[PDB]
Amino acid sequence: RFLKVKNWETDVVLTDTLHLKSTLETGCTEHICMGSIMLPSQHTRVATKDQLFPLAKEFLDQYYSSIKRFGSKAHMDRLEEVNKEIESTSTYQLKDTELIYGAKHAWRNASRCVGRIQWSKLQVFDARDCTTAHGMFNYICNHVKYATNKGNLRSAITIFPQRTDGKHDFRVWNSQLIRYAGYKQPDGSTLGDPANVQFTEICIQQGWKAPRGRFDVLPLLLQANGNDPELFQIPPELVLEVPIRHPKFDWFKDLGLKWYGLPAVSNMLLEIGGLEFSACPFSGWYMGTEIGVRDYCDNSRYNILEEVAKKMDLDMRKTSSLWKDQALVEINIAVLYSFQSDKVTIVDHHSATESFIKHMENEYRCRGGCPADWVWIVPPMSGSITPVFHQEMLNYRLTPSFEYQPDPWNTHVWK
Amino acid sequence: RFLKVKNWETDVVLTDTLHLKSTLETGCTEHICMGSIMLPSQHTRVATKDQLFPLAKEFLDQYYSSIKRFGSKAHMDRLEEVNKEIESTSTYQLKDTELIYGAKHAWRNASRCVGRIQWSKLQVFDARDCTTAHGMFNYICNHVKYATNKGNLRSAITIFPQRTDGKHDFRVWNSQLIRYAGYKQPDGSTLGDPANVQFTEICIQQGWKAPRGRFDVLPLLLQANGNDPELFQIPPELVLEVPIRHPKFDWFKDLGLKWYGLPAVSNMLLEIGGLEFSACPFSGWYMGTEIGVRDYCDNSRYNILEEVAKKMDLDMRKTSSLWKDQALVEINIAVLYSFQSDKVTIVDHHSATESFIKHMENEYRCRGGCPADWVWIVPPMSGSITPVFHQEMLNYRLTPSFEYQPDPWNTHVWK
């Protein structure tokens, strides 16, 4: 009942009691493991009043347990206070203090996140007073500006008002606030970013006028209080981009690539004490592999191993010349280099995996465990030369949490 | 109840009913996933008579189901025949035909094995008539010779007699038949192979006279019918080794490395119809990463990224120069190259992962699924540029199977 995880590079052993507080299910049963299914029906996100008080209760009991007032009159009164508001309006509202707590712990509990060492250093912007798509654009712009901080990136989250009835719903329709457009061509091939070609279309549907190129920063599509979403373009001066050069190959400039400094995931759902925030964009800084490995080299993303290997003059006949591997290490040295020569915050996959282990240490010491998803923590290149390859991680789902949710244009009862 | 696995590189979907025949547990529960624990208490291996007939029954029912005689008089008679022998001796004996079947399906069901596309092409050597450590040495030598086949490697398994009482037990004490010795030094550092330093000691304990160098091929330690194990050295002429050069760097010869052609796992337990074969060494050919990535570059293995990066003249100050990644792709181009220039069978990690997907196709089509462990199927470098990174795999434990077992010197009631 008090499980043990081992590291096989260091012969280090930690004990995990934190999983006893766990609540949600994981997809796995006694007779099957779903640890590699992408979006289980568990990780995807309508709640009633009887269901709501336990969740409000359980969350408040840990929030007061964490300020050294577990069970006092401050705790009890707030328990009755929300119990009362839950009678009155069937739902309730979070204190400013409870929002910062819940927010930070959704990150802290995010088992697929390698960078959680920074979870307490998080900036919470309360956008619960927002009412229009224009209001959302203004909060989101102030977020971009703040988190970007001149490439000295800072973590932040902006929390639009919680889902209520369920049809009056705030959503950012973009996957990330900053993403390049994706355009199909005549021959079927794809200019820009193949990932977003669906979204680019709905953008031009609603009225976007695309500069049909590669690294076209998409506009924002903002849905407010259930209304139909509206297009807004972030000021270009607030979209910090990094041109990708290499510290050897002078043709790497002619490759012509660039990426945005700020990764800002916007399309997911923040759960706090049983309340659902459908729009809650959060940002940090990039790990180099997210761009150099996945973005640039996924077959169905930018797919540049073709072109890079060419310029390197590479044995591209044989599969086993390892030319793909060769051009991937070069591509990732260049992303890191380019980002660092511009003083834009980036972390290499070795630094970040080492910290996640140092992080795992503190989570097991001062918290009794740390949920972690190996499939997603291991960087997607040079896996076993990073230290997390050899660390056993127990995955389990605590709360407060971040949950996937269906895309709006599928669910949105239009016009 | 009829689950679906998706690929996210190809938008391909397969349906898995095969997991319904599954039997053993996996460590995972509804509320926690152990998918990254190395050796769960489930994967590690004493059975009685009441327990034995169901397992014999279930196995015979699939063996006859697979030769298009499900339930006939041949099936029924054999059912009564083993039921009878299970009354008489509490245990029973497998037909030559049932041994080849069970054997091949333990490989086919081995969810951590990327090369299972070859599972039906398997050569079964029946060593159940063996009685002495000398007999074991002779069967094992004939296996080495056969599977090696002049570097044109062939898959094989040799099946020593099944565990009976439990103290009369055949075991190969080596992890792999062919492994290099591991020697601690004065300063504590390790010559040879750090992994085996424990075993090298027990070898010299029992009487080995080590040529205290690096790539010293270990002797065999063979335990027969519960007796104390005995030392035998494979004839050097049967140990095919590949010197590791690079197709560029002429100092790669001066690096001075070599590896054995034949990977032959000897320390595990073959389960067939409820019967336990404690010694059952099996071999195939190497995937390049097993040597170039793990053997040569694991921190606690040969740890050569230090020395290789030097000769390349590498930015080894900064972590984020990605010099480890750089020297790992070179190291793996050299292992592959060296092995192929000697006509010794080796497979690169791209070829092998592509076949495992082609394999997964046939297992889902003509068998209804394929148990697969993502944590172990994904190669430990360049993960996301291989196609298995993007394939969802359901893990589950069928039978016949290969199981881990405790090392003998812990359990063996000595002398």
Ligand code: HEM
């Ligand atoms: C501080 C720098 C951060 C870094 C370097 C980082 C890195 C990563 C990486 C590499 C992933 C794997 C996803 C992928 O590669 O596709 C991930 C996932 C994730 N991160 Fe972090 N991240 C950071 C900050 C944050 C912040 C600020 C939040 C929320 C406030 C957060 C919450 C999450 C969540 C919810 C996931 C995905 C979990 C899932 O998909 O179920 N992270 N992150």
Ligand code: HEM
């Ligand atoms: C034919 C060429 C083969 C290749 C290229 C291959 C490759 C691999 C690899 C890369 C692993 C992961 C283990 C690690 O990297 O540490 C593995 C595991 C395994 N293979 Fe295969 N293998 C082959 C043949 C075989 C054969 C002939 C058998 C048995 C008859 C077998 C049964 C297994 C088992 C039982 C495991 C480990 C499962 C576990 O640890 O629970 N494989 N193999």
Ligand SMILES: Cc1cc(N)nc(COc2cc(CCN3CCC[C@H](F)C3)cc(F)c2F)c1
């Ligand atoms: C703040 C931050 C910083 C940083 N450095 N990185 C990240 C990555 O956060 C992610 C990323 C994803 C990607 C899932 N993938 C994307 C391609 C499409 C594929 F279908 C799914 C999903 C999430 F839910 C996240 F939270 C976030």
Ligand SMILES: Cc1cc(N)nc(COc2cc(CCN3CCC[C@H](F)C3)cc(F)c2F)c1
């Ligand atoms: C026939 C064949 C061909 C091939 N090409 N490869 C293999 C690899 O088969 C393995 C490998 C392992 C290694 C586990 N690791 C080893 C380092 C120590 C660490 F503790 C555990 C365990 C098994 F049970 C296996 F079956 C086999």
Ligand SMILES: C[C@H](O)[C@H](O)[C@H]1CNc2nc(N)[nH]c(=O)c2N1
């Ligand atoms: C098939 C598998 O579920 C899928 O490819 C996962 C594997 N691990 C991952 N890990 C990260 N960080 N990001 C990803 O998108 C994925 N994809």
Ligand SMILES: C[C@H](O)[C@H](O)[C@H]1CNc2nc(N)[nH]c(=O)c2N1
């Ligand atoms: C911690 C984790 O359980 C362990 O490192 C696993 C990960 N996946 C692996 N995959 C393979 N092929 N071989 C291994 O030894 C391991 N080790």
Ligand SMILES: [Zn+2]
């Ligand atoms: Zn699981």
